[PDB]
Amino acid sequence: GPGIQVKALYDYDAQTGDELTFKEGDTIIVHQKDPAGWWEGELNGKRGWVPANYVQDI
Amino acid sequence: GPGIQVKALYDYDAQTGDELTFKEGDTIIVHQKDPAGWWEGELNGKRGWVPANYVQDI
Amino acid sequence: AKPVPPPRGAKPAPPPRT
Description:
By secondary structure, chain A is mostly beta strands.
């Protein structure tokens, strides 16, 4: 489908452009597992970067 | 550049995952002043959290 | 002679964006 579902393991508050803010327990769709530690995710009508170490594949 | 320089005002010994250990007088690069009291810093080849109240912008 | 560290979020540092 649109990508894999992951769960946020920790809160993250976006620090730079195009990062997602999320809370522990959010389900994020990971569209791409890009190299460099930040993945293309989507949450709550926003697409943006998610730190890959903050999420667990579910 | 990579962030702002701060001086450690006090010694801090890392207690949890991904915290930096440093000594008073260490110069730390703060990459991000994240909300929640712990900043993303870098010292001596390690990136990790720095307690924001331990450092003074220089 | 130092302040107490702020409460922790129990989380890893984000990977470098740079």
